[PDB]
Every structure is written in structure tokens, then in C-alpha cells.
DNA sequence: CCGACTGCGCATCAGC
DNA sequence: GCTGATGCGC
DNA sequence: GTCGG
């Protein structure tokens, strides 16, 4: 639906959400406001009253009350005030730097460090992640057009196969759902030699090759199963924005549960789990399991493709395209 | 009334 | 030194 | 902040 429907309300709720997460450090209030924001964003009518909004799941007494104030006045007194607050708005802003959370942001603002400029001045007080986040502050907040994501996929699948043709790599996330743009790139990686009961250079070798051809440019974090970092498409034209890329190495017997999980959406993943229990199965990130007569979970069932998971719960395979809910 | 709201990998801190 | 807790991102 | 046991 059009933003001009309830965009004022959803903007208000999103703004309240961020201050809860970043300033009050109340993560559950943060998700509460966002849940309320989401369901109102989907609501196909211009809301006339807080009581009207309250019918929706996720909208309670306090938000219905806040909406009443917004509709009547065009603003929120509390929001106006906190917007104004130099301390709170600075803390809120610094968290936009990847690696700087609520705790670091507060500590920085505590000692007078409030801006990117201030961060740029105080490099030795930033850890490795926070420096990278600072270095690519602008780039990290850009979205990635699908065409560039396709070019990025080309390089990943090529270099991965070059390392070992028996690797299996799948670019999941919104891109796999066929979105016209993405926030980052999520690559899931496996190899027949790696199972749950199973070299742990399997991830390193792929990262290394992607670094060698200068696709991967920076490393945020890297262990034996998970890589988080920065990549960039090759350039006399203007150079591309640096992009966030994650690579996960998953055991083969857990790969397609992994692919399903990290393809999303979260809203879709929720239903699929809920319907999975109603059929007597439990689905998490790693496995699908039967729930015995009292709720005792048996051994993880063998999964060799996505559809296998759909078959167990008697679902017909839904294409990633049709997985926004 | 009052507990749940995903929980894990990695980097780094806190403490022994 | 090591172990467990915390911060962070997702 | 919201929901529900
Ligand atoms: N249990 C649980 N799992 C979650 C939750 N939130 C997310 N997940 C899981 C399920 C999600 O699929 C995954 C996050 O993948 P991203 O790449 O960060 N999001 P995407 O790629 O779709 O969009 P973008 O284009 O912006 O990158 O984490 C949660 O609250 N609870
Ligand atoms: Mg993504
Ligand atoms: Mg991601
Ligand atoms: Na409600
Ligand atoms: Na941040």
C-alpha cells in the first residue's frame, strides 16, 4: 500500500524503535515497535484512530494512545523531545557505524565523541570492525541493485568452483527470493567432505581465493565456519561501492535446512515452523526432527534438498520467489 | 501478574 | 596463560 | 511494548 496512507505513523514507530534499541537498550521494546510498524505498514486503510489500530496484532494500549496524539497533533511530544536531545541523538547516530552498538555508542558520547569526525579523530579507540564500519559508513548504507548482485554471484560461484569443483555455494537472502535490490550478500557454502559427524581450511581456502582476485577487500570477522567482511566489483569508470558479504560453511547434512533458513523471509520462516509443529515436526536452522508422542524430539531426518523439508510437512514446494510470507 | 520475545559465531572484555 | 561473559551482527 | 499462560 501507499506510504502516504499511514507513513507518518510507521515513521513515528520506527523512530521510537531505534531509540529503544540504541539509547534505552531495550531490545524487546525495539522489536515491539517494529512489529507494530510492520503490521500497520501492511494495513490497507488510512487509520482514523488509535482504537482502529489496536485491532491489529502487535498494537497495544500505549501505541494506540500514541497514534491518537499523532493524528490529533501531527507529532509526538516525547519523540520531538528526544530528537532534540544532543546526547540521545548522538548515541542513536553512532550506532549506524557497523561494529558500534548501543554500549560502544554510549561510551563514546560519554567521553565527548559524538560524530564521524570525532571517530575519525580517535582511531586508536576503535576496534578492527569499527574502523572498517567507519571507513565504509556511506557504502554500507547503500542498497545493492540486483544486476550488481548477479555480477557478484558470478565471481563467487566461479572462484569457489576454481578452488574445488566439489564445493557447493548458494547465494541466499533476499536475492534468492528474487528481490530487485539487496542490503548485503549471504553465501552458504558446503563440501561433501564436511558433515556433522565429520579439513577446517575449507572456508579459509575460499576466502583466500576471493581475496587473491581482489573481490574480498576487508575482513570483519573470520573463524572456521563463518566469514564476515567487505567485497567490491572490479572497476575507467567510477568504482563500485564496497559491500557487505557473509560466507557460512555448513555441514552437508545440514546444508539445505541452512539454505531454507537463510533464504527467508523471517515472516515466511515463522509460518513454516508453526505449520511444521502442527504436523509433528520441529524445524530450526540446522535440522528437521519428529516430535514423539509427548514432545521428545527424535533423530534429525535426512535432508538432501529443500523440497525434502516441504515433503516431510506435507507442503508443496514454494519457490523462493513466493516466500515473503 | 509476569515471563517470553532465536540463539549462535566471532572478537574482545572481565576475571581467575 | 585459560575460561566464561559480554558486545555485536544477523 | 505486546501478548498470553
Ligand atoms: N529466529 C530468528 N531468526 C531470524 C530473526 N530475524 C532474522 N532471522 C534469520 C532469518 C533470515 O533469513 C536471516 C537474515 O538474513 P539477511 O540477509 O540479514 N536478511 P535478507 O537477506 O532477507 O534481506 P537483505 O536484503 O536486507 O539482506 O536470519 C529472528 O528474530 N528470529
Ligand atoms: Mg541479506
Ligand atoms: Mg545478511
Ligand atoms: Na492489538
Ligand atoms: Na552499529
Tell me, letter by letter, the H, E, C secondary structure of A214-258: CCEEEEEEECCCEEEEEECCCCCCCCCCCEEEEEEECCHHHHHHH
Question: For ligand 1, is residue A186 a contact (CB within 6 Å)?
Answer: yes
Q: Which of residues 27-86 of A touch strand D (CB under 7 A)?
A: 28-29, 31-33, 36, 56-64
In whole angstroms, give the CA distance from residue A30 to residue A301. 36
Whether residue A1 is contained in a domain is answered as no
In whole angstroms, give the CA distance from residue A187 to residue A262. 9
Discontinuities after residues in chain A (C–N over 2.5 A): 198, 235
Using left for φ > 0, alpha for ψ between -120 and 50, and beta otherwise, residue A295 falls in left
Residue A189, H or E segment: strand A185-190
Distance of CA A315 to the CA centre of its chain: 26
User: A236 - beta bridge partners?
Assistant: none
In whole angstroms, give the CA distance from residue A307 to residue A313. 10
Q: Which three cell numbers stand for residue A93?
A: 547516530
Residue A182, H or E segment: strand A181-182
DSSP at A287: -
User: Domain boundary residue among A85, A100, A123?
Assistant: A85
Name the method of structure determination: X-ray
Residue with the nearest Cα to atom 31 of ligand 1? A266
Backbone angles phi, psi at A212, to 5 degrees: -65, -40
CA of A52 to the centre of ligand 1 (A): 30
Protein-proximal positions, strand B, CB < 7 A: 4-6, 9-13
Specify the CATH number for the domain of residue A55. 1.10.150.110
Whether residue A312 is contained in a domain is answered as yes
Domain total in chain A? 4
Specify the CATH number for the domain of residue A184. 3.30.460.10
Same domain, A160 and A255: yes
In whole angstroms, give the CA distance from residue A233 to residue A243. 9
Radius of gyration of chain A (CA): 23
Residue A290, H or E segment: strand A288-290
Residues of A labelled catalytic: 66
Residue among A95, A96, A181 nearest A143 (CA): A181
Report the residue count for chain A.
325
CA-to-CA separations, A273 to A3, A29, A58, A279, A325, in angstroms, rounded: 31, 24, 20, 10, 12
Assess contact for A255 and A193: CB atoms under 8 A.
no
Whether residue A205 is contained in a domain is answered as yes
Q: Residues near A287 by Cβ (< 8 Å), separated by ≥ 6?
A: A254, A257, A300, A301, A303
Same domain, A153 and A234: yes
Task: Kindly report whether the peptide bond that precedes residue A269 is cis, defined as omega within 30 degrees of 0.
Answer: no
Assess contact for A222 and A229: CB atoms under 8 A.
yes
In whole angstroms, give the CA distance from residue A118 to residue A231. 26
User: Domain boundary residue among A142, A163, A181?
Assistant: A142
Same domain, A78 and A107: no
Same domain, A172 and A207: yes
Same domain, A245 and A273: no
Same domain, A17 and A66: yes
Whether residue A223 is contained in a domain is answered as yes
Whether residue A241 is contained in a domain is answered as yes
CA-to-CA separations, A173 to A118, A229, A266, in angstroms, rounded: 35, 16, 10
Same domain, A153 and A250: yes
Assess contact for A203 and A227: CB atoms under 8 A.
yes
What's the CA A100/C1' C3 distance, rounded, in angstroms?
Answer: 26
Same domain, A164 and A269: no
Same domain, A130 and A161: no
What's the CA A74/C1' C7 distance, rounded, in angstroms?
Answer: 37
Q: Which three cell numbers stand for residue A164?
A: 574445488
CA of A184 to the centre of ligand 3 (A): 6
Q: How many CB atoms lie within 10 A of CB A244?
A: 22
Assess contact for A130 and A118: CB atoms under 8 A.
no
Same domain, A13 and A76: yes
What's the CA A207/C1' D3 distance, rounded, in angstroms?
Answer: 44
Whether residue A255 is contained in a domain is answered as yes
Q: Which three cell numbers stand for residue A41?
A: 505498514
DSSP at A320: G
Same domain, A95 and A133: yes
User: Domain boundary residue among A239, A261, A283?
Assistant: A261
Q: Could you identify the residue written with the cell 548477479?
A: A150
Q: Which domain holds residue A270?
A: 262-324
Q: Which three cell numbers stand for residue A94?
A: 553512532
Three-class SS state of A306 = helix
DSSP at A317: P
Q: Which three cell numbers stand for residue A300?
A: 534429525
Q: Which three cell numbers stand for residue A146?
A: 540486483
Q: How many CB atoms lie within 10 A of CB A146?
A: 15
Q: What is the resolution of this structure in A?
A: 2.2
Whether residue A132 is contained in a domain is answered as yes
Three-class SS state of A313 = coil
In whole angstroms, give the CA distance from residue A157 to residue A173. 16
Question: For ligand 1, is residue A320 a contact (CB within 6 Å)?
Answer: no
In whole angstroms, give the CA distance from residue A82 to residue A38. 23
CA-to-CA separations, A234 to A142, A157, A158, A163, in angstroms, rounded: 17, 16, 15, 20
DSSP at A124: G
Same domain, A93 and A198: no
Specify the CATH number for the domain of residue A279. 3.30.210.10
Specify the CATH number for the domain of residue A136. 1.10.150.20
Assess contact for A277 and A288: CB atoms under 8 A.
no
Whether residue A17 is contained in a domain is answered as yes
Residue among A53, A24, A25, A22 nearest A40 (CA): A53
Q: Residues near A207 by Cβ (< 8 Å), separated by ≥ 6?
A: A216, A219, A222, A227, A229, A247
Amino acid at each position: 500500500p501507499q506510504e502516504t496512507l499511514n507513513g507518518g505513523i510507521t515513521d513515528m514507530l520506527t523512530e521510537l524503535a531505534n531509540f529503544e534499541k540504541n539509547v534505552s537498550q531495550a531490545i524487546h521494546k525495539y522489536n515491539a515497535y517494529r512489529k507494530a510498524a510492520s503490521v500497520i505498514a501492511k494495513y490497507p486503510h488510512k487509520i482514523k484512530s488509535g482504537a482502529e489500530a489496536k485491532k491489529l496484532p502487535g498494537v497495544g494500549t500505549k501505541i494506540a494512545e500514541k497514534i491518537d496524539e499523532f493524528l490529533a497533533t501531527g507529532k509526538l511530544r516525547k519523540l520531538e523531545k528526544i530528537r532534540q536531545d544532543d546526547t540521545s541523538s548522538s548515541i542513536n547516530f553512532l550506532t549506524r557505524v557497523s561494529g558500534i552498538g548501543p554500549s560502544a555508542a554510549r561510551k563514546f558520547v560519554d567521553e565527548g565523541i559524538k560524530t564521524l569526525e570525532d571517530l575519525r579523530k580517535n582511531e586508536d579507540k576503535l576496534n578492527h570492525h569499527q574502523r572498517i564500519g567507519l571507513k565504509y559508513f556511506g557504502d554500507f548504507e547503500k542498497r545493492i541493485p540486483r544486476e550488481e548482485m548477479l555480477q557478484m554471484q558470478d565471481i563467487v560461484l566461479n572462484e569457489v568452483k576454481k578452488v574445488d569443483s566439489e564445493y557447493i555455494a548458494t547465494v541466499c537472502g533476499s536475492f534468492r527470493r528474487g528481490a530487485e535490490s539487496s542490503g548485503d550478500m549471504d553465501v552458504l557454502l558446503t563440501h561433501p567432505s564436511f558433515t556433522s559427524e565429520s579439513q577446517p581450511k575449507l572456508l579459509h581456502q575460499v576466502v583466500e581465493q576471493l581475496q587473491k582476485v581482489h573481490f574480498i577487500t576487508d575482513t570483519l570477522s573470520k573463524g572456521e565456519t563463518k566469514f564476515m567482511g567487505v567485497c567490491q566489483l572490479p572497476s575507467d569508470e567510477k568504482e563500485y561501492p564496497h559491500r557487505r558479504i557473509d560466507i557460512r560453511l555448513i555441514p552437508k547434512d545440514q546444508y539445505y535446512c541452512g539454505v531454507l533458513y537463510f533464504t527467508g523471509s523471517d515472516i515466511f520462516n515463522k509460518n513454516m515452523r508453526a505449520h511444521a509443529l502442527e504436523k509433528g515436526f520441529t524445524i530450526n536452522e540446522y535440522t528437521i526432527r519428529p516430535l514423539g508422542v509427548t514432545g521428545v524430539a527424535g533423530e534429525p531426518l535426512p535432508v538432501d534438498s529443500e523440497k525434502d523439508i516441504f515433503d516431510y510437512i506435507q507442503w508443496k514446494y514454494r519457490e523462493p520467489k513466493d516466500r515473503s510470507e
